[PDB]
Write a protein that binds this DNA or RNA. Structure first.
Lengths: 201, 149, 261
RNA sequence: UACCUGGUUGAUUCUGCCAGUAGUCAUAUGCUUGUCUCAAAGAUUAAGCCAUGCAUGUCUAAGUAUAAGCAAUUAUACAGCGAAACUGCGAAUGGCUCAUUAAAUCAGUUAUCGUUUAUUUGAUAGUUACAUGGAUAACCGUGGUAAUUCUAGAGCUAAUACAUGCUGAAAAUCCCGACUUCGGAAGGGAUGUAUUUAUUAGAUUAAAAACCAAUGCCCUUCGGGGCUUUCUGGUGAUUCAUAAUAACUUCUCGAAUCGCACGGCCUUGCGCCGGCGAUGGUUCAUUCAAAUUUCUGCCCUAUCAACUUUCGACGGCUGGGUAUUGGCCAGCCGUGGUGACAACGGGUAACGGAGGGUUAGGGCUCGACCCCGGAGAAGGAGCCUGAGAAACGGCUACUACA
RNA sequence: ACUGGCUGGGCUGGGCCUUUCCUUCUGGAGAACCGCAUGCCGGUGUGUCGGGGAACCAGGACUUUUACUCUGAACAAAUUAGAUCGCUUAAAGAAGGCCUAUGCUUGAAUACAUUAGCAUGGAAUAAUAGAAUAGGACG
């Protein structure tokens, strides 16, 4: 099958090599497995020394994490929007490492609301259709947040306005093709400047 | 170097979180949130341009994840027209026992040069063995010798 | 070569086994165990070629199989068992106890010991650190791993093991003034006193030793084996590892032979 | 044993070769052959072609026995030996040959902080349960074909095969909180190990103070004077070893397994506890190793002087793939890399080395061949099982033979 | 074969002086020379008595670079040279030997390869850099 040796190559002075030996059991390679978006399907391969690997073909949700607040909830992924290597991947929504995707904030925002009773990214005041609230079953709990707010602080303005639309930017940092779990984290700060201009300009 | 970020991806040291709300000043460069670096040893000193810099180069033996172990050699800079690599020249003397006198020989080698150092043609160099980086690069520049008149 | 090798051809065996170049084509091929293949003592050559108890291959296997001989207190019946440095082999039904130890020529001897001194060993430590869960442990030269050892102990030192429970009983440092015994090289079997040490950051440091007769020699650290600071903790064999030269050796041997006869 | 003789001329002295003399673990052949010790032998041309016979199987008290199997008569589940067959392991070691190969193999010397490892050795895992489910072999009996180590359909049954599957106890940590005397609290969940991601700890070199905000306090004359305090391993060098937090998984492991002994307690119940072994099991360490890898070293040729990148040639970046690094592969971007110190190409009646033959010293020549390393089983390619194969006394297809 | 002597003659080496001496910091233990007294015949163990500069060890910093030579480490077995033992001798082999013995005792040595790589001493020989528009050294 495929081979990954160096014999078939050409030396650094330009000299063509000669034939040395037949192909070997080790040094082989396998057909690159492709991962896209779809119903969960997984293939298992048996590697050297009685070990196994996992192959991602279609995925819809994976573990993501917000480092600053330390919340990790397996949210659902919408679509890859930008890939640094080549544009061809984005159109067909095939996801690889360091691919900017779209993630919703349904679990993450829900966790933030428990963390504090403070509105986050609300520009629907004109409509106020969904405005509702429920009384916390104590007053000591407000004391806890009234003191937690003192040191933790508030989310920076640029990131907030992203929740208004309800779509967050993420980067995949796992290896779909080896492990099978498309893990990722959520970006913040000065990193926004570089990617923001690139993505929609 | 003009711009630090000029590629498709974003260049950053791995596992170095920068966007923390609280700010704390301390030691241990990696832990605090500033540039990380280590020391190679053998009496070699990390230059100041490596610590008070902004370049990202995952290959550089300082501020990177490559260890140096094995031979240590010296040579010549014969060309620096390439991108962050150089070619070194080393001369020696063969024996030829039958005729009881020596020959001159010649060999060229390719070593990774870090962005920290600056090396124009005609200068000394010291290299050390590392992990296989490219098809023909297995060494890294460590000490540019002072320039004599 | 399409797998591991499983035969070992005669004329390639280690020289210190003292096998003849005639009488067969193959050698015992020691199996895999705690000691290196190049530095080990097969039980079969010990029983048949050294003690002369058995005459043939067949009778050799009967002795280990009948559970009549036990290395280090555990009766192991495999023939090609690797026995190595400082280990204690005991045969109780006949009341002999031996220790594998070098002579001044770099080979193994038939050393007799007493039943009181056959109940402890000592070994060099190669790595000390903490395993899983934070427990600290160390492993010696015959693949004994003990945990929860005295924290003061450091690498390259020597520790004493009890051989029935297996806990450190005492320790030794590695510095100037100790008593050592070399285990490999040209200087196999010498006994000396650490004069001073020289360190080369990057590999293969050297040490200088001084004999009792004021001789001088040197070796690498990974080849010295400390067996005491003073008053060696084991019974040295005949000759005490003093490395006489050729000239005196012939002179004294003839004198002793004539005097006896 | 550091050695020479005959031959051009009518005769002489030279340069110069031809011939003579000796060895060879160096081959063939002719003539001849009484004894003792030792024993090489289809390599050279044809890695050309092959009839026939053989060269790899395996059982102990310890995986599975209703043989209409043998042997007795201590076993009313069995209990001794034991055909056939299922299951486990090896068959990847040995043995043969030298076709290809000119920085390729190989030699000495380095590295894995860049990886895999059955087996061996030593440690090591608290978060219906007097025991769970369906097939199949051997076996009785009915068949096909001229042809085979081809096999069909019908009726039974075992697992250390396959698939499920509870396991005793408490503490401590982070969250949710029934509840207001604005001060802590009822009860509620999670917490082994395997995988993946993100964050945190993993310190330290010599000292004296002075300010902002405030809360554990001791002594105490209630004026107040104060203030002491715990750990943290290793290498020349790391994001190392190890620990903590938030989570995740078509998701593992934590013994439904076999032999010997026949013991101790008191509510005397077909009760409770108890020994030595075999076979297995997650992780770490070791051994036999394996795969890559740093420096230097090869015979002849210029009637071979400029080579490499179309379709990777030198490097940078982002990914894919492999047990792991790497222009190994996929995309984007620079224009490089080697050479008279002989590159590139061509020849070899060329496997490399340890070494053999002959000698003043310096050398010349041979090395298929008993030891180490490499490659191959007619020529090419492709693959299943397994820790280990691109295997050929394993399979698939083409070529050439048969 | 053993013992002493020559201010015996030499060869190799180590210390000081002559403008030359030979880097430096931290820590360890401790001898000789010094003063005390319990003791004996100008001296010593005395003691948790104390003051100097120096031999060793451990730790840190500094020094023109290659060639050359000496000494170390590490590097198969077989083969080469070579020690011992009357296989009846020899080529070979690694055996064997002693008394009477229900026993004792030994050997299976040593040197070389020599290029490349790792340390150490030497500083002649053959190359190479340093202050000149001072952009020089020290406090």
């Amino acid at each position: 099958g495929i081979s990954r040796d160096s014999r078939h190559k050409r030396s650094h002075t330009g000299a063509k090599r000669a034939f040395y030996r037949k192909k070997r059991a080790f040094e082989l390679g396998r057909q690159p497995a492709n991962t896209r978006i779809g119903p969960k399907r997984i293939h298992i391969v048996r590697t050297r020394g009685g070990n196994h690997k996992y192959r991602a073909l279609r995925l819809d949700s994976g573990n993501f994490a917000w480092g600053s607040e330390g919340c990790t909830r397996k949210t659902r992924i919408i679509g890859v929007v930008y890939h640094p290597s080549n544009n061809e991947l984005v159109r067909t929504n095939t996801l690889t490492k360091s691919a900017v995707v779209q993630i919703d904030a349904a679990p993450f925002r829900q966790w933030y609301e428990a963390h504090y009773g403070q509105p986050l990214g609300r520009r629907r005041q004109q409509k106020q259709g969904q405005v509702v609230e429920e009384v916390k079953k104590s007053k000591s709990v407000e004391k806890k947040q009234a003191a937690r707010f003192a040191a933790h602080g508030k989310v920076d303005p640029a990131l907030e306005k992203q929740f208004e639309a309800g779509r967050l930017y993420a980067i995949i940092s796992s290896r779909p093709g080896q492990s099978g779990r498309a893990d990722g984290y959520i970006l913040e700060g000065e990193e926004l400047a570089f990617y923001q201009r690139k993505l929609h300009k | 170097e003009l711009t630090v970020q000029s590629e498709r991806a974003f260049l950053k040291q791995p596992h170095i979180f920068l966007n923390s709300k609280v700010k704390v000043k301390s030691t241990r460069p990696g832990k605090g949130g500033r540039r990380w670096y280590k020391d190679v040893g053998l009496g070699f000193k990390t230059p100041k341009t490596a610590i008070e810099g902004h370049y990202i180069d995952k290959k550089c033996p300082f501020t990177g994840m490559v260890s140096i172990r094995g031979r240590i050699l010296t040579g010549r800079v014969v060309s620096t027209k390439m991108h962050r690599t150089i070619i070194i020249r080393r001369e020696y003397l063969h024996y030829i026992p039958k005729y009881n006198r020596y020959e001159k020989r010649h060999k060229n080698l390719a070593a990774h040069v870090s962005p920290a150092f600056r090396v124009e043609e005609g200068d000394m160099v010291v290299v050390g063995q590392c992990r296989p980086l490219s098809k023909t690069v297995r060494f890294n520049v460590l000490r540019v010798l002072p320039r004599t008149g | 070569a399409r797998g591991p090798k499983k035969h070992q051809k005669r004329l390639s065996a280690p020289s210190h086994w003292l096998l003849d170049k005639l009488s067969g084509a193959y050698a015992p091929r020691p199996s895999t165990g705690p000691h290196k293949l190049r530095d080990c003592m097969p039980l079969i050559v010990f029983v048949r070629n050294r003690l002369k108890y058995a005459l043939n291959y067949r009778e050799t296997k009967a002795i280990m199989m009948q559970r009549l001989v036990k290395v280090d207190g555990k009766v192991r019946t495999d023939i090609t068992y690797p026995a190595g440095f400082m280990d204690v082999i005991t045969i109780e039904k006949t009341g002999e106890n031996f220790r594998l130890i070098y002579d001044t020529k770099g080979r193994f001897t038939v050393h007799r010991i007493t039943d009181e001194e056959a109940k402890y060993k000592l070994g060099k430590v190669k790595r000390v650190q903490l395993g899983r869960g934070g427990v600290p442990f160390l492993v010696t030269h015959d693949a004994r791993t003990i945990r929860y050892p005295d924290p003061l102990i450091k690498v390259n030192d020597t520790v004493k093991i009890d051989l029935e429970t297996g806990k450190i009983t005492d320790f030794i440092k590695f510095d100037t003034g100790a008593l050592a015994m070399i285990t490999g090289g040209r200087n196999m079997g010498r006994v000396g006193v650490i004069t001073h040490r020289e360190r080369h950051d990057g590999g293969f440091g050297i040490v200088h030793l001084k004999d009792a007769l004021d001789n001088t020699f040197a070796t690498r650290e990974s080849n010295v084996f400390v067996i005491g600071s003073e008053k060696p903790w084991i019974s040295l064999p005949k000759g005490k590892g003093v490395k006489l030269t050729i000239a005196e050796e012939r002179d004294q041997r003839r004198a002793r032979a004539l005097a006896a006869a």
